[PDB]
Design a binder for these strands. Sequence first.
DNA 1: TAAAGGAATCCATTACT
DNA 2: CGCTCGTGCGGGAAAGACAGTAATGGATTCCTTTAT
DNA 3: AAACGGAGACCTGGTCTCAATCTGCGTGTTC
DNA 4: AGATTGAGACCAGGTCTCCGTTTCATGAGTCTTTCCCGCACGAGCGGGGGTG
Lengths: 281, 292, 309, 292, 93, 92
Amino acid sequence: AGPIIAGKSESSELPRVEDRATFIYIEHAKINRVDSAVTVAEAKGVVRIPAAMIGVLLLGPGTDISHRAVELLGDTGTALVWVGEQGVRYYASGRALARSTRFLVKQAELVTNERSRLRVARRMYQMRFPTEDVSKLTMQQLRSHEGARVRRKYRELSKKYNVPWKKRVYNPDDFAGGDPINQALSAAHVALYGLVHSVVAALGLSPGLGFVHTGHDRSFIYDVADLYKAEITVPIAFAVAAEAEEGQDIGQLARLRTRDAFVDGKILKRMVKDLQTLLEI
Amino acid sequence: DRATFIYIEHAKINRVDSAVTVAEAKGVVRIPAAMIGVLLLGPGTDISHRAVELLGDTGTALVWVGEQGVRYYASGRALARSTRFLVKQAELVTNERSRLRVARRMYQMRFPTEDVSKLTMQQLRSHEGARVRRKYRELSKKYNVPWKKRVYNPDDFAGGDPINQALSAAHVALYGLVHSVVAALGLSPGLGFVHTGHDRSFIYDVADLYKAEITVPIAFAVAAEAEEGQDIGQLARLRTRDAFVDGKILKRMVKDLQTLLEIPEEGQIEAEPLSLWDDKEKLVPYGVNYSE
Amino acid sequence: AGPIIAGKSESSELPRVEDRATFIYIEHAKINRVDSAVTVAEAKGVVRIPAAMIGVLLLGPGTDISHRAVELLGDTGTALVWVGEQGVRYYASGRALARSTRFLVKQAELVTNERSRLRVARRMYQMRFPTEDVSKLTMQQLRSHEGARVRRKYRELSKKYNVPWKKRVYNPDDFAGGDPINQALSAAHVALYGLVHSVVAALGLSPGLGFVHTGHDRSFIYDVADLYKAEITVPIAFAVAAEAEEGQDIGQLARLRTRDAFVDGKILKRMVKDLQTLLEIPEEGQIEAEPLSLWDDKEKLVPYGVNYS
Amino acid sequence: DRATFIYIEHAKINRVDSAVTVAEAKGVVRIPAAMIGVLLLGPGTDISHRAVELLGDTGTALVWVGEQGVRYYASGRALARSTRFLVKQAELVTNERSRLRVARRMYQMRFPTEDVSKLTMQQLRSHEGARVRRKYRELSKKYNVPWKKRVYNPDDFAGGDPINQALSAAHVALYGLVHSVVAALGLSPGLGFVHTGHDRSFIYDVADLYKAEITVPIAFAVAAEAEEGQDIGQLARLRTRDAFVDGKILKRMVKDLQTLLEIPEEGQIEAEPLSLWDDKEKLVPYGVNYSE
Amino acid sequence: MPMTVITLKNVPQSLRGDLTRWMQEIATGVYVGNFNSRIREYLWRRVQETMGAGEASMCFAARNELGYDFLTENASRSVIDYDGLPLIFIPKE
Amino acid sequence: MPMTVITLKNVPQSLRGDLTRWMQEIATGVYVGNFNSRIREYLWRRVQETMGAGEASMCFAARNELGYDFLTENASRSVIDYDGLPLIFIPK
DNA sequence: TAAAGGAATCCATTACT
DNA sequence: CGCTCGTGCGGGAAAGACAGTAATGGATTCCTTTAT
DNA sequence: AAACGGAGACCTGGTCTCAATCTGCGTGTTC
DNA sequence: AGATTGAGACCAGGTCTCCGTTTCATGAGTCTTTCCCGCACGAGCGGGGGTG
């Protein structure tokens, strides 16, 4: 092929969306491109991030990121999520890792047709809960059932792990993250949202073309994330809250446990295959 | 119905109470975030976590670009995190009737005189190719630069005519700014009408509107005055950069994107660029404080 | 354990007998020890040999080795075989890798008893030729039949690959030749004999306590090598002799194809298992608390290192 | 039937026409190949491929040893490639009657002042332990060296009493010579009669013959003649190698190995521990050339 | 995925930092990663085209007795196959 | 068997040669080898005891989504754990 | 006047794009 | 019940369509010297 | 404002070489 | 004679600071269709306990 420029790479030179790590959390540091490498600088020293092997690169409070740093992070398909306190605050992504827009046009075709939208909503709800049958449920009924089931799962896991819980269903837009249960849920949930955003942006899908969630630019991200949220993140967050000690970093423990859950459950390959079968390919 | 497109480069944005603090060498600017619509973080810009927090709170659409948008590097959300433009684009591109209507509108704004109601999609493509050849020949005879066929080698840019290099560089700069505007507005670059099957199909479908009138004249001009031994890609990028510094091209692109999707004129939003150190007189009434 | 010293390693720190590489051929170079490392110095540079990862080392013509190099190689279980012209010339090895002698005791018991020796030779013949039945013939009949089938295989493969064979057979004792076929057979068999010697030495078995072959210190080496020379080395050497063009190193290609055959046929794990099953050693994963013990008539083993006042 | 245990150290052995050559600093030696029975290659020895081939052709056994055989490092084949010693050892160790016979023989040659042919294994080992204790006390009182009880850690050599360190070093220096002789003669070190279950069992069985007569007195002499802080293991090894220089112990060991295996006197080969420059006048009539 | 190691000596700082997007740098000039065959081959091609006048050596899992094989591009230490087995050869000055 | 890499800087010459006895020297102080967990731990103990006043760093195939993990003895480049992911941290 | 012939005129066929 | 080799389904890349012009030979037309 | 390349500056660590000293790594009748 | 160690030497490469020059390595006037390669899939032996 053509000449290779340091800091520029083709999509065939990169690991697939499935073969890369999940995420890295960075806080109280400075992302900076030096020697064509994304380096996070802290007080003690610097660490050079393997961007090509990481899906999403979460950014914590007190994080300053350069311009060429974002350029290089978008080059390798790594998505950026400004994970502050009480939820995800901003998203950012490069162009894409897939040069074929077949999945995007298929998603547009399925989202612009009302019958297809209802069919995809039923498929997603069935995929969340395979024991039920919803072949005759309407869109509002589907949304209400999803809310009821997620609240039921929250309360069930609250009683299971013997922890106080305020039934506050996690909404990343202005969440209430005061409690240790709230902090653990947010710590797992921002990682899941970042992973979903990275996968969607890497596969070429439009984050705005949602089926259940709609009305904003990240609707499809929220749909795909809610598909696995109750089944992955909530048990992990409740276990972290239940299994905790005084003076222990709740956020770090929650992120460790949720990364372990992502690896054990293969949520990345599962996410890609679920997008495959959810869009009729 | 107002959308500010601020291009910040050579600066470091932070936040104090509720307003971003641009820290350029010229001085410190204290733009309130409530009136910022699109923030084009150009080269040499350092954004901070508090700044991103405040901007995402107000629905700002940060876009990491090159010089005045010559290259598109990354983007955040859209204006007010709205997806009405994306929804309209999808609904117009999925069905062949609306897709053909939009392609015809594309052709008719590119060529107001020619009728489009009888041309099919491939007829539109063929006619566009013919007019492109005509424009190439006309500008070649106007600027002296001779014109053998466009021979773009995707993997080898060094091997080619200086005019071919100029066309390639000007066109990629145009693609960059078109992509920046599309990402800021919230449309998907994939869902293209005339162009289909690629990641940036809509980007080409918006760049061909301005190719013959902006980037092709620029490329022919830079090739005509190109002295031997000088790289043409940098010259074309810089000339397109200046043409974008003028700032009307971004307004035209936002207007044309709103026109393609038959957005009602009552609900259409108007985009205007804002330079901090060139438009401070209008910014002072808006509450934009300056310090030198 | 004890303090770690460069040049001395425990048996556990080294790979098992079957997990190592097969062999290395070295010629026209000097093996020495520098920086506690076995280094082969050629006319142009040095090559540090991962001796812990290599089962046996072959020494070609014009090769020098130093005393410290030899003891260093013997530390890691690597055996030295002086594979000159006309076949294997000399062997060398250090202490056995296996501290226990549970294999050597059984080998001695079988080789001393005439009935057990007959049974073991019969089992060897069965492994070489599984189709036939060997419940009746005697030792001399076994030797005559194995020789007949060996030259039968030689003639068969010589006709198959169209190579001229002068009604000969390969035996490492005084086998001389200059033809490409003889050189290919020698190169293919020296590797097998070296690997067999390394496996036997690393298992603690006595190379001299052979069953079919008798009268020399490397009889058991020959017997264990016979189980695979017909299957592996002979067809490989014939193929090398047929394939090679003019002006080509017949030895180099022979050894390359020999290593390919050893990797493909899994000769090393198979060899360990064959040695374990010939001696009728039951599988026993438990490890003894102490290898050495004093022998008693009535109490069998009695612990060592104690003063009986 | 005589075996020449020629010892080579600080030399570089090659081959001239059909006889190995020695390249010691003193001069050049041209020993005929057939002359050498066993070549004990000491430290600083460079053996060549031609030399190894020639020595293997004549049945010579090459044993890479330490200084005067204190450590056994590697061994080639048996002397004259013979195996009758190994087969006899296997026959005598396999069956219980011969095992009792040889164990009683070893104990009896270890007990010159008593007849122990009637004692069983328990009584024999009790008597051996009592004799060991008596010899320890005798050599402790002779050299005025304190002695309480033999205590050592195989995994911690330094953390031991100087007496125990000296005894361990001398006994290991004996094991090296015993292993060298066993390997040169063709026996198997694993097949021991009294000691069983180890690679080096027969070596310990043979070395117990000379433990109380060589290594224990040497160890106690070293312990008595030693200042605090001196490396006593090196001193014990050096004294033991000084004991082996004369070669009387080598001949005694060969003869004892023959006696243990019930070898007929006609079949008993005799070791000839030759030294290169010590026995020039003895070796010149035999065809050995001594150049300087 | 098979483990890949690349050692770089005297190469432009652009490549030295660029490889860190794929492989972490355990020590100066030494990078370790886990890729499939295609990604590793593209990484080696990139190293070849970017190192300029420098020394680069890669070791990756293979199907020989040792289990690894080397590609050296303008490196001081060559690789010699001893009858199908890779041994690193050090020329003497 | 997994893959192991050992980098040694400023260590005695004997340690370098001894590692060459186990694993080949691709680079100055950089060794690669194939063997299991037991031999790897024994080699790491050997390096730990016989490195003196030098730094050692071993990267071995492991069970994290990067696919490898690190053990450093008195090394300049520390290893920092970002929520289950080992990253090489260079102090300033 | 008209054959006649080639150059120029207009046209048709195809490769260029 | 965890390992391999032979069977293939998402990516490619390459031609191959789809549309009309530019130049040149042929048909046509005009001149223009041929011959007269 | 960033990030790079070039050009210096400088340093540590690797390697070669010269005397100088040793020949080497130590249980097996100890609990 | 071979190998190790300490000393002392040299020097190549690494790292830092400084400086001036950049904001960059530049396709799609058009695509579908027919080709492919993929790195997944694939199945049996296992090795059981059971068989003997």
